[PDB]
C-alpha cells in the first residue's frame with residue numbers, strides 16, 4: 001500500500017540522486033546543505049541551474065535569469081517594486097482570472113494605482129476577452145497569471161497588450177510546455193509547483209527593465225542588484241537551487257519542454273474526456289477554451305456539486321490511496337493536479353477510478 | 364575524510380535527513396514534496412517553533428516566525444516593520460563590522476539612519492556603550508551581536524535607555540542563553556549556526572507588529588506572517604525541517620547552556636595559543652570583545668607574514684583542514700567554531716598551531 005499524490009512532487013530518480021549525494025556531494029567531502037554559496041562548487045551548481053533554465057526555455061540573450069527567495073507572493077511585491085516606476089504615473093494594469101492574480105493585484109495596490117483591465121469576474125470560469133481589455137497606455141506594465149492553480153484557468157496563448165511590458169506569474173505551469181520568452185518583460189515562478197521544491201523562485205527579466213526599482217525595494221528582491229550579482233547578492237537558497245537543477249536536468253533527460261507538453265496533453269485529455277462524456281455526472285466549471293492542463297477542478301452530481309457523492313468520491317479515493325484530490329475550500333468539489341512529476345500511469349488510475357465511480361453512482 | 368572550519372551540520376542530523384528523504388517517517392512522501400498546508404508539515408513547523416521557545420526560553424509575549432530572504436532580508440524587513448514606530452522614521456545603529464555596516468546602509472532606503480558612535484578606523488572593538496550618542500526619538504536601536512568577518516562579539520546586552528532593541532544574531536544564534544525579554548526583535552539566518560540556508564528565524568515582541576510601512580512586502584511583514592504562523596505563503600519547508608533537527612540535536616546535547624560551554628572550551632583553546640605565541644600569532648580584536656564563533660588572526664606579525672601564512676594554510680590543507688583562510692577583505696587566517704565544529708576538531712587545529720609555531724618561530 002503506497003500513496004498516489006495528485007499534487008506537486010519530485011520525480012523519484014531525482015530523490016534517489018539527492019539521497020545518494022547527501023553526506024558527501026560528488027566526492028567533495030561535504031553536503032550541498034553545508035556548501036558555502038561562495039565556493040566554486042556552489043558556483044558550478046548555480047551556473048548549471050541558470051544554464052538549464054536558458055536551454056530548456058530557449059531564453060534569448062537579452063534576458064537575465066535570477067534566483068530569488070520569497071516565493072510567488074514575494075514577486076507579487078517584487079514586480080511592482082522593480083517596475084511600477086517604469087513610467088512616472090506609477091500605474092499598472094492587471095488581469096484577474098483567479099485567486100493568484102487577485103492576490104497579486106491586491107498586493108500591487110501598496111505600490112501604485114492598479115487598473116483591473118476587464119469587468120471583475122463573478123466566477124473564475126474564463127479569461128475575459130483580451131480585445132476588450134481596457135489598457136492604460138501609460139501603465140508601467142500589464143500583469144497576468146498563466147495558470148490559476150485553484151480554479152483551473154490557463155492561458156494557452158500570449159495576450160496582445162499593445163506593446164506594453166508583459167509580466168507573467170508562471171508558478172504552476174512553469175516548464176510544462178515551451179514559452180516564447182521574448183514576448184515578456186518579466187516571467188516568474190516559485191520552484192515548488194512544478195520545477196522543484198519550496199525556497200527558490202526563478203525570475204526571467206528583460207535586460208532593459210532593470211534600473212527602475214523604487215527606493216523601498218529590498219536589495220535581496222531588486223532585479224538589478226540580483227542580476228549584477230548572479231543571484232549571490234546574499235546567501236541564496238542553496239539546496240533549493242540544487243534541487244531545481246536536478247529537476248531541470250530531469251526535464252532535459254525526459255525530452256525537454258516539448259516532451260512535457262506532450263505529457264500534459266495526454267494526462268489532461270484523459271481526465272477531460274471522462275468529464276466531457278460523463279453526460280452531467282462530472283462538471284468542470286471552466287469554459288473549455290480556458291481549461292488548465294495542470295489543475296482540473298470538477299463537481300460531482302451537478303454543476304453546484306452534490307455533497308454526499310463528493311464525500312464518497314473522496315472517501316473511496318482515500319481508500320485506494322489516491323491522495324490530495326480534495327478541491328480547494330473556495331471552489332469545493334474535486335481537483336486533480338497533474339504536474340510534470342505526476343506520471344501518466346498515476347493518471348490512468350485516477351481515470352479508471354472516476355469511470356468506476358460513475359458506473360456505480362450515476363442514476 | 365576532511366575537516367571544515369565553517370558552518371556545518373552535525374553528522375547525525377545528515378544521517379537522519381538521508382534516512383528519511385524518500386519517505387518521511389513512513390508517510391509515503393518526502394519533506395521536500397510535502398504540502399506546506401498539510402498536517403504532516405504543520406507538525407514540523409510547529410516542532411521547530413517550540414524548540415526555539417524552549418531552547419532560548421522565549422517569553423510568551425514574543426512571536427517566533429520563520430521567513431525567507433536571509434539575514435540581509437532582515438536588513439530591509441527590520442526598518443520596514445519598525446522605522447515607522449515613531450514618526451521621525453529614524454534608527455540608531457551600532458556598527459562594529461561588515462554586517463552591521465551593510466544593515467545600517469540598507470536601512471537608509473527607509474529612514475534617517477544615525478550611527479551612534481564615531482566610525483571605527485578598524486573593526487577591532489565595540490565602541491563603549493556609554494560613549495554612544497542615542498536618539499530618544501529614534502524608532503529603534505540596532506546592533507550585530509557577532510561580526511563573522513572581524514571576530515567582534517557582544518558579551519552583554521547594550522543599555523539603550525529603554526529603546527526598542529534590534530539584534531542580528533545570525534552567526535552566534537543558540538551558542539548561548541539569551542535574555543530575549545530585553546529585545547524588540549532578534550533575527551538569524553539559519554545557515555551560520557543553526558541549520559541550512561533558506562530560512563531566517565525572527566523573534567518579535569508582539570506589541571511591535573502593525574507599525575509596518577505600506578511598502579513592506581507582505582511576506583516580510585511581521586504582523587502578516589505571525590498572524591498566519593509563518594504560513595502566509597509557501598515557507599522554505601526543507602530549511603525549516605533541517606533546522607528543526609539541528610535544534611533537536613542542540614536540545615539533546617544540553618541546550619543553550621551546553622553550547623555556551625562548548626563555545627568557551629573551543630575558543631579559549633585557540634586564544635590560549637594565540638596569547639602565548641608571544642607575537643607569532645596575533646589576533647586584532649581587543650580581548651574583551653573577541654568572538655567565540657569566529658577567530659581571525661595573522662602569523663609572523665600583526666600585519667601578517669605572507670610566506671608564513673601561505674605555508675600555514677598550505678600545511679593545514681595537507682592535514683585535511685579546510686576553510687581556515689581569513690575573509691578576502693581582511694587576509695590572514697580565520698577559524699570558525701560554530702556548534703557543529705567539535706572539540707575534537709578544534710583539538711587538531713590547536714595541535715597544528717603549536718607545532719607550526721614550533722617548526723617556524725625564531
Ligand SMILES: *Cc1c(COP(=O)(O)O)cnc(C)c1O
Nearest residue numbers: 071072073149171172190596597
Ligand atoms: C503557489 C502559487 C503562488 C504562490 O507561491 P508562494 O511560493 O506560496 O508565494 C503564486 N502563483 C501561483 C500560480 C501559484 O500556484
Ligand SMILES: *Cc1c(COP(=O)(O)O)cnc(C)c1O
Nearest residue numbers: 234235433434435511533534552
Ligand atoms: C552571513 C551573515 C549575514 C548574511 O545573511 P544572508 O542570509 O546571506 O542574507 C547577515 N548577518 C550576519 C551576522 C552574518 O554572519
